[PDB]
């Protein structure tokens with residue numbers, strides 16, 4: 001019984017509901033100056049209904065929305081999500097709040113349901129861009145391990161479980177896919193930094209969401225990178241998410257980056273299976289992760305896209321919004337463009353297939369590049385912007 | 388999962404918790420929740436997260452979540468205390484001594500000391516401390532403290548300027564003038580939870596002259612501050628004592644109790660701030676000594692803590708250092724200001740020697 005108490009106090013914070021001198025209203029967050037997806041969808045009503053309810057793992061509602069409280073604004077590009085899931089139970093315990101987020105982000109309604117997997121890279125039209133415009137190509141997705149708490153709340157022991165488990169199965173791969181794990185704890189600074197500068201490694205734990213949600217606890221115990229000799233298939237271990245599987249290469253041959261991601265993902269998902277550990281999956285929303293942007297396919301495919309004329313255009317960002325494309329910096333989400341170059345990728349992840357989402361990138365990329373071209377030639381693109 | 392599966396990997400770390408945490412003491416406390424729901428992992432997290440320090444000092448690396456934390460994990464917390472304040476489980480904390488008249492010296496040379504400051508933190512009982520407290524409690528503490536503060540009369544009275552309604556430009560000015568606390572980027576502050584919902588329930592109270600001030604809901608519930616330019620510690624102590632008396636009374640009057648233990652004096656977030664929870668500092672100019680191979684060693688012996696011109700999370704600029712009393716537990720207030728003054732006295736002399744092209748080996752404490 002004692003462990004029950006311990007487990008449900010996992011947070012180690014005072015629970016304002018239990019002893020009764022406070023109403024929910026007395027704890028209601030102040031989101032006056034806030035601009036995220038949680039402060040868009042959170043209603044005093046929802047809070048009153050959700051604050052005193054705790055998942056089997058000790059996760060509380062405030063545990064969830066803490067990063068959106070602590071982060072009203074953004075010094076870079078985009079509007080943040082302002083909330084995380086702490087376990088495999090958080091979406092269900094607070095479904096009426098998370099359904100609304102999922103809608104804003106993915107355009108995926110409470111009545112909606114995730115489609116079957118399509119990883120056929122061969123069904124893909126386009127994907128091979130001129131290297132003048134496209135500097136390199138990257139496809140990544142994320143996965144969680146089943147019955148384990150996610151990063152924001154997972155304890156030390158669970159994280160050491162994950163690293164073992166995953167860095168184990170990753171050694172089952174073979175051929176141009178074989179490779180080696182490199183734990184961050186023994187990695188010296190210069191190597192670490194050179195891997196980040198080169199785009200193969202996750203940043204130092206300085207990101208807002210990373211620190212305020214609690215994915216940077218105990219750093220770097222449990223944090224590591226696995227890659228092949230070519231370093232064109234890499235896996236991250238225990239940063240934002242237990243696993244990120246990453247295909248990438250310089251140039252503009254997306255199609256080849258997808259053909260490999262598809263080849264490596266299927267192995268990894270199978271080997272994980274082959275060791276007895278499943279991956280956190282929901283019937284309605286597919287695959288689950290720390291952030292509600294990372295659901296469904298969890299796929300985000302991007303290019304480094306130099307747009308020297310179109311970026312200066314007034315309706316550039318609008319075009320991105322309608323074309324349903326994120327816009328990040330050269331070095332990532334917490335970075336600004338360089339040399340007029342933007343990381344540009346599919347925004348929605350829930351409610352389309354891997355191939356469908358990669359076709360979106362492709363199709364919108366062409367329009368983005370085709371307009372840069374029109375502009376160069378002292379011309380107009382007013383009609384090539386979606387209505 | 389046992390306790391041993393979750394024991395922190397402190398291979399690199401350098402701080403008190405890493406220094407005092409045994410596998411044996413982790414197995415015992417790890418599954419022990421306080422009355423308010425605060426855990427042992429909650430308490431030590433800041434130290435696991437923080438193996439090193441970019442600035443001066445070996446850091447603590449652990450905190451109390453609430454008023455029951457010290458008691459719950461006492462076998463581990465008594466070891467951290469002893470390292471810091473040189474205080475034993477058998478010892479007791481003396482009766483307060485706020486009489487600045489018994490003070491010897493405490494009026495240094497304008498050449499050497501640009502300003503003085505005396506502060507202590509206070510904790511409102513009945514509610515959790517900044518690391519574990521809800522928005523509900525923090526709003527509660529803020530209302531209760533700013534009410535009582537209306538009570539101040541004379542030259543001490545001032546206004547309460549809430550942080551949520553203060554604009555970034557006033558805020559930046561108060562910090563650069565050393566009055567207000569720094570933006571929430573400190574490793575202790577963030578990794579210990581003290582910056583959740585920031586700035587909800589945060590603010591600073593201060594008189595007109597801005598020589599007497601109060602911090603509300605940064606690291607500790609309350610912090611009481613006296614400071615001024617020049618080198619008249621004895622005056623700042625004079626003022627400090629008055630106001631802290633008035634403050635405790637008013638709080639006592641509103642039927643609000645501060646977290647106190649008959650042995651360990653007053654109790655706050657960090658085990659560095661117990662007892663008198665007092666830090667008396669001078670901004671010291673040391674152009675000659677600072678280059679000496681035994682400098683830091685002298686401070687250590689003198690029980691002086693070293694900090695930068697901007698506070699804890701800064702280095703010294705302009706050969707000017709934030710020198711202060713290291714301990715707070717085990718000695719009255721008067722005694723610690725005497726330790727501060729006596730050390731600052733020595734430091735100044737030594738500087739003069741080195742400047743006169745002279746040596747200071749016999750000056751270094753034995």
Ligand SMILES: Nc1ncnc2c1ncn2[C@@H]1O[C@H](COP(=O)(O)OP(=O)(O)O)[C@@H](O)[C@H]1O
Nearest residue numbers: 136137138140199302303304330331332333343
């Ligand atoms: N198309 C691309 N080509 C090369 N590197 C990329 C591309 N897109 C992103 N990256 C790199 O991947 C790293 C991860 O950035 P982030 O936005 O945090 O990605 P993710 O969403 O996969 O976590 C960054 O350093 C970034 O430079």
Ligand SMILES: Nc1ncnc2c1ncn2[C@@H]1O[C@H](COP(=O)(O)OP(=O)(O)O)[C@@H](O)[C@H]1O
Nearest residue numbers: 502503504506565668669670696697698699709
């Ligand atoms: N002796 C002093 N004279 C003038 N300003 C001081 C003195 N000591 C500290 N300060 C200022 O007071 C502020 C307190 O910050 P810090 O030292 O981090 O916290 P604490 O007040 O708890 O020690 C800092 O801005 C610092 O510049």
Ligand SMILES: N=C(N)NCC(=O)O
Nearest residue numbers: 080081082209291293
């Ligand atoms: N989780 C992320 N890294 N990005 C999406 C967001 O911040 O809302």
Ligand SMILES: N=C(N)NCC(=O)O
Nearest residue numbers: 446447448575657659
């Ligand atoms: N309480 C503090 N702010 N500092 C003391 C320490 O972290 O050791």
Ligand SMILES: [Mg+2]
Nearest residue numbers: 202240332333
């Ligand atoms: Mg990322």
Ligand SMILES: [Mg+2]
Nearest residue numbers: 568606698699
């Ligand atoms: Mg401080």
